[PDB]
Amino acid sequence: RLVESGGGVVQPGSSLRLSCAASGFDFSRQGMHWVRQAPGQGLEWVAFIKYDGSEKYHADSVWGRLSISRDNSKDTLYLQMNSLRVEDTATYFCVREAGGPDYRNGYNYYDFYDGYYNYHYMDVWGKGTTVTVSSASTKGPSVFPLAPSGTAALGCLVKDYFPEPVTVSWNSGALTSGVHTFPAVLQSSGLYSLSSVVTVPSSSLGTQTYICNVNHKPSNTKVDKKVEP
Amino acid sequence: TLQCTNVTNNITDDGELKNCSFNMTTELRDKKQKVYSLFYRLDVVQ
Amino acid sequence: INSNKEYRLINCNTSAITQACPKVSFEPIPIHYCAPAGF
Amino acid sequence: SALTQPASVSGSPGQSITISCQGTSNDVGGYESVSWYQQHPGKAPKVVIYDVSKRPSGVSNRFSGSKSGNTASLTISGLQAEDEGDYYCKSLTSTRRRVFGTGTKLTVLGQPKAAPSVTLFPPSSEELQANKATLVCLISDFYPGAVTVAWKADSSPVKAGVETTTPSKQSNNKYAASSYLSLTPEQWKSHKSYSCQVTHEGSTVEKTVAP
Predict the structure, then answer these.
(1) Which cystines does this chain contain (chain D) (predicted)?
(2) Does residue C16 sit at the B interface (CB-CB below 8 Å)?
(3) Is C13 on the interface with B (CB under 8 A)?
(4) Interface contacts B/C by beta carbons within 8 Å
(5) How many angstroms separate the CA of residue A106 from the nearest CA in chain B?
(6) Whether B23 contacts chain A with CB within 8 A
(7) Rounded to whole angstroms, how far apart are CA atoms A26 and C26?
């Protein structure tokens, strides 16, 4: 049983220490990895360590920023994450790959005094501790009533807010037909930019009132923007 | 079979002591032992 | 020793174990201790 | 440097498919240690293949693996819905580090394939007076969701200041995604026109806007 911990929502330029607390086996004679994963991305590999901790291999995307360390006595791995940046917004797993339990000539050879080896894979894999390096803070959204160019569809552009979510209803919830509640990006300043528009026919463009009720929750900024061409 | 190394010193030789890692056995007849010991050159041969 | 639990004998880490063969018994047999001449 | 995988595969249920992982002779072509990982949304990866041919206890016999040269392949026979997920290969390298594939999003196919609807919005006048400009390329109603987005100022490719979402699911059983283009008002007015080219399943749809 691995306890992948230590992560959190931090800033670029900060520092942090992770923890892969290990039970269910002998961590003291088993080499481990850190393995990160940006949200919705591939497994960006981090760093390998020896079964006692002298070797500290690293991917050069994390090196020497996210330095792997361990304590054999504590049965706990660590990732000394230094000088953090936006690429550390990721989910940090704990992975064993090397080694074999040296069953040779029909007998269990072991190294120093009947330890456990690495087993070419894991009995239980990494859960993933999440470091989330964003840049912005609690900021109200800049909501813009999208001028429609049949279906010349319109809506509201919920721009420049952090963090998640905005709960954009329409006309105090009276309008719901056609609401494309579409997800929020991570833009350059750390803020978010979605558009939970309502796709309407071209007849009621401004005739129907379109008050997007953009309740950003961490900034408490309910922006009401009537939509017209 | 003993896997041994010239003992740790800073050059200025020309050893005789070896760091010898070998697979050994324990009191429990099934499980075995991996140990290291230091031997004089006169007790072994390659 | 620390799936199902595994066990090992108690003497394994102490003393070489033998077994008294079933022919030989343990039954206490009355013994008369005797002394030689001059004693 | 990542091991190269195809961004996505797809297949009808019962279909057999293959994913390729192409490394160098110092990782994939240099060792037998190639292993393969399956990942579901919000869950941690699980190893479906190891030592390049081998299945870990509990894995279906529908999963096989192989290696030719510097390219190792995972092959899934008889796709069932539950095979849908992202697939990553891991390799060992000459310096004894580990490296992962770029990943593959595999879609077992619910419904028939569908192409994207593309809407492009010119920068709002409220934003232009704010001394900023942004182009909004909105993509919708496609499947399976995987999309290359590409921007062109005039006919020239533009890699500067573009952020794109990961395709997200809609209520209608199709995907959606967006791509935003950051520009200075001068950039917007200076250029002739700006294009959004979405490549889905080898096919590109394009929209265009101009000052």
Answers:
(1) 137-196
(2) no
(3) yes
(4) 4
(5) 9
(6) yes
(7) 46
Resolution to one decimal, Å: 11.5
Single out the residue in D110, D131, D157 at which a domain terminates: D110
Q: Which residue does chain B place closest to C11, by CA atoms?
A: B27
Chains in contact with A via at least 3 Cβ–Cβ pairs below 8 Å: B, D
**In a shared domain, residues D59 and D148:** no
Please tell me the distance from the alpha carbon of residue D90 to that of residue D35, in angstroms, as a whole number: 5
Separation CA A63–CA A80 (nearest Å): 11
Residues of chain A found within 8 Å of residue D176, distances taken between Cβ atoms: 180, 182
Strands (E), chain D: 8-11, 17-22, 35-39, 46-49, 63-68, 71-76, 85-92, 98-100, 104-108, 117-121, 133-142, 148-153, 156-157, 162-164, 168-169, 175-183, 194-200, 203-209
- 3-state SS string over chain A? CEEEECCCEECCCCCEEEEEEECCCCHHHCCCEEEEECCCCCEEEEEEECCCCCCEEECCCCCCCEEEEEECCCCEEEEEECCCCHHHCEEEEEECCCCCCCEECCEECCCCCCCCCCCCCCCCCCCCEEEEECCCCCECCEEEEECCCCCCCCEEEEEEEECCCEEEEECCCCECCCEEEECCCCCCCCCEEEEEEECCCCCCECCECCEEEEEECCCCEEEEEECCC
Residue B37 touches partner A, C-beta closer than 8 Å: no
Min CA distance, D163 vs chain A (Å)? 7
Residues D106 and D5 occupy one common structural domain: yes
Tokens at D148, concatenated = 């290359």
Give the CATH number for residue D71. Answer: 2.60.40.10
Give the domain range for residue D82.
1-110
Tokens, residue D12: 């009808």
D3 & D104 share domain: yes
After which residues does chain C become discontinuous at a C–N distance over 2.5 Å? 2
Experimental method, per PDB record: cryo-EM
Does A103 contact B at CB distance below 8 Å? no
Tokens of D5: 């995988």
